[PDB]
Design a protein around this ligand. Structure first.
Ligand SMILES: NC(=O)c1ccc[n+]([C@@H]2O[C@H](COP(=O)([O-])OP(=O)(O)OC[C@H]3O[C@@H](n4cnc5c(N)ncnc54)[C@H](O)[C@@H]3O)[C@@H](O)[C@H]2O)c1
Ligand SMILES: NC(=O)c1ccc[n+]([C@@H]2O[C@H](COP(=O)([O-])OP(=O)(O)OC[C@H]3O[C@@H](n4cnc5c(N)ncnc54)[C@H](O)[C@@H]3O)[C@@H](O)[C@H]2O)c1
Ligand SMILES: N#Cc1cccc(-c2ccc3nc(-c4ccccc4)cn3c2)c1
Ligand SMILES: N#Cc1cccc(-c2ccc3nc(-c4ccccc4)cn3c2)c1
Ligand code: NA
Ligand code: NA
Ligand code: NA
Ligand code: NA
Lengths: 489, 489
């Protein structure tokens, strides 16, 4: 029974969450969050700045202070708390999906069956990890006792983008909390509503005050305050590569806080001659056009082996025709509006760039109408490495298709980039599959699928696509400090 | 039969090591390395710069390229190569100890029975780890196969100081090499001889050319070229906290290369009333005066509980007077000269600061004589938190001793710092020992000992004393990138 849309439900939580209490800005300033579809203003949210960040950091330090209720808890009890938060999230699943779609213009069905699903699963997983975070006892000498503890790093700041506001937020809160940290979170300016509702849910679930604080605001104000705050021990950022460099160098400059970075990527897609062409084309269509093409794992490059190149292109064009584009709450829609104007502007500008460099076009190339921010699915052909459509992270609906002959060739080409978030390989041949998986400088390598994210499997970027990892057991390493204890007898 | 010092053996390796070949600096410039005890010039070493590092990085990139001899090697074969390097290190152990002591003025016995010992043990340990670097296979769905590979991160630059030139170099080379990386190393300007001799040994053992390249030179020229090189994937730095911040932020600005930082620390020493006062005094004396007090783990603050404060002070002073200080090659000496002229100057300057800020003095407080750069072992008393000898890393022979009453008190006081490298606790009480071990924000916590370093146990700093860890299995995490491979069926 697919739920029907929550038509016009009002917002309730719009203030700064600190010590389980709602506060007004120190300055009193407030900003507005708008609807990417209605093109009209949704509501107003408190606009925090450096003083509010100072207050939240103090709260988080007090909740983390030795002997605090949060510190004294059982590992199993922290896990139980995370499970409680997951239960609450599930109870209010439709409300959260509705807020998410209002804030991002994402299809309500997408928000219900993707964002919230991943949120719940991530919460459950890291809840399971809470009482299973184990260090080592080390052999050294007959008279010595040597072991390691994995302790919480302390206060952790989180900074998240607009494409998946809540999900990217859960990815950090879950592991950080199961390791017993305290947090200061900052949602994007565009989409702060889900984060504040989750703060209400955190309070309801019984987390001690000060363990999670939420301060909405703008990147250069609240973000900069967190990234260079002297009392924050860890920072986790997901966003653009440039702001990621800014954050990491601010952390280096301030207090040497540890940094996790989930950034962008020129994600390649590799189709081999022996592929299941139907599934390959379908998955490439998805990886290029899902969520309006605005996700960290967008396929920007598509290498096809000559033996099927033309056939692939043909089928690709075909598949692009039957793609729903309309109301986000529409049950038969797969693509909503864009986020703001700059992304739409530069997407059309680089479509125009590509058509002027010698690439055959077969689909779309314009905007449907001037009611929202919709673009027609575009499909390019006869693309080269030297073209901008093959070297710049697109972040939109466009499928540039290149041609290759050798395995070694496609390896060299795909790896020529500075990014390395994801890569996808489609082939039925065991040897080619495994050789490519081994050779691709990519943090995730999907084979005969796409967007296969799992709470149990680590996600992250090689090279300039990130530093640490989220999801999986690996996320735990970013939220713990190792201490050695050596005792002579 | 302990060997006597190799009296007057000439230096042989003084050039830039690249592709197993010795090169003169592109510029032709050279700098001079001197003997801190004889005060006379040891030798001249090639002074490399950005061009030299570019050449070395190109060598390392080609040696790491897919299909190279280094890549095609077996895990067990990499381990055997490391073991060969260890054998060679042991064969030439006396030459190397002589080089290190000539360069640093370290007691030759200390270099032979500590530095080279730790080097060989570290090499053996990480050689053992080579074929045991294993990822995971992850449960997900009935039709899915998910696993992770731990791959070499790529080209690794290493920057290491003068206090333990060869050891701090091995601490990086061993784990980096057992994981199948390639390296560009830069020893400190003061002490590059052991590194170049080690390069000769590296060639002899059979490492393919380009796997390890060494460019001596100064921090701002070669060091900066390394830290911000766009073709360096990882950086490992050991030195001062400020230069560490500089290095991490240059890495942030250049290409987001991963960073390991072993920095300084206000290493506390905590003596409880129920300690073995004799052992407490002996280990604190050693931890504050060993290697002339110029090591990362030097005890700069010594908290004593009132019940034993005065007696401790007495025994400490007495123990400090009877400490040999003379020729490093003299078999009955425990303290050689200082590092260079600036460090001796500032050590005496802060001795004067301490005596002029209100601390009772009982040992030294001036320079012994002017035959080398020697200082008499100094011991201060009745020092408080706010005094300069208790808040600035001493890095010399000086034992500031404070007084405490409570366990909670000493915990809060010790943790008030921004550093967190090491701490030492001396007590016979199980509960106090373990409670302190848990509460101290310290990367290493010795109990009833000091300077107990083990290749099997990770070493590193909390807070502003570092980022990653060296030694142990944990070091491996710093030299590998995690890749997820997900296959649908
Ligand atoms: N590089 C350019 O010249 C250029 C061109 C077009 C658009 N843009 C803008 O870049 C942004 C990309 O959007 P995005 O959300 O995917 O990535 P982002 O870089 O804007 O970061 C997303 C999250 O990080 C926060 N943040 C932004 N700057 C920060 C900073 N200096 N310090 C700390 N936190 C900061 C943001 O508040 C948000 O929560 C858009 O706002 C876009 O308008 C930039
Ligand atoms: N500016 C001052 O006020 C001042 C005064 C006296 C001494 N110093 C310096 O402090 C240092 C004492 O601490 P230390 O020598 O044990 O550790 P360190 O901080 O000097 O670092 C040791 C290693 O890092 C290298 N390095 C230095 N600067 C670098 C940079 N910008 N980029 C990359 N690599 C760099 C060095 O060549 C060396 O190999 C000395 O180097 C001394 O010259 C500074
Ligand atoms: N955490 C999380 C998260 C967030 C978003 C999406 C996903 C996600 C992505 C892909 C996916 N395929 C399956 C599946 C189910 C049955 C058979 C075969 C495959 C589940 N899947 C979940 C997970
Ligand atoms: N890796 C390494 C490394 C580097 C420098 C020094 C040391 C180091 C430091 C202290 C130490 N005590 C023992 C020992 C031996 C026998 C019985 C009890 C203790 C060995 N020890 C090695 C290790
Ligand atoms: Na908005
Ligand atoms: Na390996
Ligand atoms: Na007690
Ligand atoms: Na702690």
């Amino acid at each position: 029974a697919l739920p029907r849309p929550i038509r016009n439900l009002e917002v309730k939580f719009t203030k700064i969450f600190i010590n389980n209490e709602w506060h007004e800005s120190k300055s009193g300033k407030k900003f507005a969050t708008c609807n990417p579809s209605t093109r009209e203003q949704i509501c107003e949210v408190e606009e925090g700045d450096k003083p509010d960040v100072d207050k939240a950091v103090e709260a988080a330090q007090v909740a983390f202070q030795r002997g605090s209720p949060w510190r004294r808890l059982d590992a199993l009890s922290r896990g139980r708390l995370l499970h409680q938060l997951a239960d609450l999230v599930e109870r209010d699943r439709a409300t959260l999906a509705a807020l998410e779609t209002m804030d991002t213009g994402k299809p309500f069905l997408h928000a219900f069956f993707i964002d919230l699903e991943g949120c719940i699963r991530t919460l459950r997983y890291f809840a399971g990890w809470a009482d299973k975070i184990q260090g080592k006892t080390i052999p050294t000498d007959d008279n010595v006792v040597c072991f390691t503890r994995h302790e919480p790093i302390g206060v952790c700041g989180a900074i998240t983008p607009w494409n998946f506001p809540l999900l990217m937020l859960v990815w950090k809160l879950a592991p950080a909390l199961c390791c017993g940290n305290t947090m200061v979170l900052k949602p994007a300016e565009q989409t702060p509503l889900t984060a504040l509702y989750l703060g209400s849910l955190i309070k309801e679930a019984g987390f001690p005050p000060g363990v999670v604080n939420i301060v909405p605001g703008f990147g250069p104000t609240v973000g900069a305050a967190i990234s260079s705050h002297p009392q924050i021990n860890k920072i986790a950022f997901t966003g653009s590569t440039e702001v990621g460099k800014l954050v990491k160098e601010a952390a280096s400059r301030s207090n040497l806080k540890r940094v996790t970075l989930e950034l962008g990527g020129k994600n390649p897609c590799i189709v081999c001659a022996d592929a299941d062409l139907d599934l390959a084309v379908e998955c490439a269509h998805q990886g290029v056009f899902f969520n309006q093409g605005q996700c960290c794992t967008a396929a920007s490059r598509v290498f096809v082996e000559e033996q099927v190149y033309s056939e692939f292109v043909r089928r690709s064009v075909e598949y692009a025709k039957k793609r729903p584009v309309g109301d986000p709450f529409d049950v038969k829609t797969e693509q909503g509006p864009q986020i703001d104007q700059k992304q739409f502007d530069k997407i059309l500008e680089l479509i125009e760039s590509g058509k002027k460099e010698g690439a055959k076009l077969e689909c779309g190339g314009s905007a449907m109408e001037d009611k929202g921010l919709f673009i027609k699915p575009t499909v390019f052909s006869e693309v080269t490495d030297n073209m901008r459509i093959a070297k710049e992270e697109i972040f939109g609906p466009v499928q540039p298709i290149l041609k290759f002959k050798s395995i070694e060739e496609v390896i060299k080409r795909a790896n020529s980039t500075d990014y390395g978030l994801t890569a996808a390989v489609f082939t039925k041949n065991l040897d080619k599959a495994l050789k490519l998986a081994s050779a691709l400088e990519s943090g995730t390598v999907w084979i005969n699928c796409y967007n296969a994210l799992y709470a149990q499997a680590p996600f992250g970027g090689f090279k300039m696509s990130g530093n640490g990892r989220e999801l999986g057991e690996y996320a735990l390493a970013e939220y713990t400090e190792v201490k050695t204890v050596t005792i002579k007898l």
